[PDB]
Ligand binder design. Structure first.
Ligand SMILES: O=C(CCCCCCC(=O)Nc1ccccc1)NO
Ligand SMILES: [Yb+3]
Ligand SMILES: [Zn+2]
Length: 607
């Protein structure tokens, strides 16, 4: 097994056991500067050198046993960064540990980091910094074996301007004034559970907290605290359900941090401190499945981890499966099936977008010479989910398959694993149903592009109204438009309204007159729920409604969740009326965008 996204020595040569990070966040220079002390364990006899990943890091020196040592940085390999070879001063025997202290500074263009000016924040007085290391951005913060095949504990001391707060994916372990600079405070952290380095995270800004459960604080700027506390109030109930499904929660606290709007993902499962988009702040808790997802990664991802990124689906697909059980326990089995079926629709979309023979539609993907951020899609989520839901149905239902899931989490806790590890364990657990498992077309599900070979069975109860209303609109002629009215929506939940629009969007464009009628009778322009507004605006732009141009440009730029920003820019570029403005808008905003989002939007727009 080779990690084709990492240039570091593999785990078979040496393993990092601990990181102690001492750093200072310099907002004037947009640099993090300090020392990364790696405790490294040789796995070989006579070990005399090793290699770490880095990306846009300036290295000042490397210290082992109190003396500077030789090191060299290799040529940059695009998104992978530059390998750093370190010459050890004394050859190591197998299992010997040493500490390697590297003094480094980050680049302002670090792909792991977004540096925000005061104007870019809610409070407008103070700047803000946040990280996003998954998949392979930790190397752009500090030198490391930047591979999920290696798990380490960490401690950290972070010096920041004294008016600001630092938080990490770790337990808070104190704060004191910085003795080197009384304008600063050092915040300390400890992560005692071994983690892959993609789970290292840092935020610095003017943060406040509010308790919302026995093991949960919400953190955000002051302006968002009250709304966030309400929106995420189900979090303890979800954690309790998740513990029933997965076993004990091992991480101590489960805090939430609500980022500024350019955070690129819905959420990120950083241990102890899940990061979430403010786009979840719908006002009615309706987008709480994202919280259930991130919670679920406390087991599937954070405890049992993909050994390399080719096996991402292990992390995401199992998380989606647990996510959907939490939501089904809370809101009912009919809702689990509704969400499940919605997920298949998203998979349909992704397969159509890439093409049915595209490599990135395989469940296990080969990332040789592929930047994960470019290949990122709904495929691992939803083809993964569909496999597990198909297995659930084959093997005797949800209670049975949940016994497997708990057993799997137990078996592989604290480890990093491959698809074949998972498959082997599935066969071991279900050894009395091997004949059933042998009906599965493993090669097609795991290794073939396109839609899966079999579609699961779904309860249609909550979906039927959505499909019926979509079909009414699609089949309407001009003389049927008058028949639509606001009462059509009266028995539909926000989730159903979303699914009505996703179903309709799958047949877009519709006639411009239909779309104008839809606004006249349903007033979708008034809905601030981000998922609904996203699909509505896509529907309007694809249907060539010029009045939607400013609305779509506004949503694309006022937040930066890539789920929303990328397809809105792409749709606006594809509409001749908005094309030039879309490209100008991107060009104007690009320097102030998150670095990954900026990259991908530029690729999408061919800029
Ligand atoms: O699932 C999420 C949202 C995505 C968070 C970022 C994932 C980045 C990543 O690991 N990308 C990737 C990995 C493998 C293959 C392709 C992309 N939160 O839990
Ligand atoms: Yb030896
Ligand atoms: Zn996830």
């Amino acid at each position: 097994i080779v990690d084709t996204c990492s240039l570091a020595s593999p785990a078979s040569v040496c393993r990092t056991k601990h990181l102690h990070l001492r750093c200072s966040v310099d907002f004037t220079r947009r640099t993090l500067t300090g020392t990364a002390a790696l405790t490294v364990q040789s796995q070989e006899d006579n070990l005399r050198s090793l290699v770490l990943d880095t990306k846009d890091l300036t290295i000042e020196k490397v210290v082992i046993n109190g003396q500077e040592v030789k090191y060299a940085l290799g040529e940059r390999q695009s998104y992978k960064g530059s390998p750093m070879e370190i010459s050890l001063p004394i050859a190591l025997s197998k299992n010997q540990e040493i500490v390697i202290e590297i003094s480094f500074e980050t680049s302002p263009k670090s792909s792991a980091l977004q540096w925000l000016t005061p104007e870019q924040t809610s409070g407008k007085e103070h700047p803000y910094l946040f990280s996003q290391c998954q998949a392979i951005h930790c190397r752009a913060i500090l030198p490391c074996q930047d591979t999920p095949s290696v798990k380490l504990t960490y401690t950290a001391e972070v010096s920041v301007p004294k008016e600001l707060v630092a938080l990490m994916s770790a337990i808070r372990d104190g704060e004191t004034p910085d003795p080197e600079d009384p304008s600063r405070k050092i915040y300390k952290f400890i992560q005692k559970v071994p983690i892959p380095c993609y789970l290292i995270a840092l935020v610095v800004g003017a943060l406040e907290s509010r308790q919302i459960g026995p093991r949960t604080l919400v953190w955000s700027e002051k302006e968002q605290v009250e709304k966030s506390a309400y929106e995420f109030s189900e979090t303890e109930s979800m954690l309790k359900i998740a513990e029933d499904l997965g076993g004990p929660y091992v991480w101590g606290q489960y805090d939430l941090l609500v980022l500024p709007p350019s955070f690129p993902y819905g959420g990120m499962e950083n241990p102890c401190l899940t990061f979430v988009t403010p786009t979840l702040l719908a006002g009615d808790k309706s987008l709480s499945n994202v919280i259930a997802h991130e919670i679920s990664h406390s087991w599937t991802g954070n405890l049992v981890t993909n050994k390399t990124w080719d096996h991402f689906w292990l992390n995401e697909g199992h998380t989606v499966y647990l996510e959907r059980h939490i939501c089904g326990r809370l809101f009912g089995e009919k809702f689990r099936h509704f969400n499940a079926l919605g997920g298949w629709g998203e998979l349909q979309n992704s397969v159509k977008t890439f093409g049915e023979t595209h490599p990135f539609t395989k469940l296990v993907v080969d990332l040789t010479d592929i930047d994960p951020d470019v290949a990122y899609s709904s495929v691992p989520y939803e083809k993964g989910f569909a496999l597990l839901f198909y297995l659930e149905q084959l093997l005797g239902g949800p209670e049975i398959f949940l016994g497997f899931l708990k057993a799997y989490v137990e078996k592989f806790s604290y480890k990093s694993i491959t698809t074949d590890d998972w498959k082997d364990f599935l066969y071991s657990y279900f050894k009395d149903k091997v004949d059933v498992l042998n009906q599965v077309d493993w090669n097609a599900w795991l290794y073939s592009p396109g839609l899966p070979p079999i579609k699961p069975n779904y309860d249609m109860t909550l979906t039927n109204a959505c499909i019926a209303l979509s079909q009414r609109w699609i089949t309407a002629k001009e003389d049927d438009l008058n028949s639509f009215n606001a009462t059509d929506l009266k028995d539909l939940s926000s989730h159903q309204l979303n699914e009505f629009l996703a179903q309709t969007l799958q047949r877009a464009p519709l006639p411009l007159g239909h779309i104008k009628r839809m606004q006249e009778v349903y007033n979708f322009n008034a809905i601030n729920n981000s998922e609904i507004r996203f699909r509505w605006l896509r529907l309007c732009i694809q249907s060539k409604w010029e009045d939607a141009i400013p609305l779509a440009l506004k949503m694309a730029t006022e937040q930066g969740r890539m789920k929303f920003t990328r397809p809105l820019f792409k749709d606006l570029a594809a509409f001749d009326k908005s094309h030039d403005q879309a490209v100008r808008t991107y060009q104007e905003h690009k320097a102030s965008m998150h670095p990954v989002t900026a990259m991908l939007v530029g690729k999408d727009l061919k800029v």
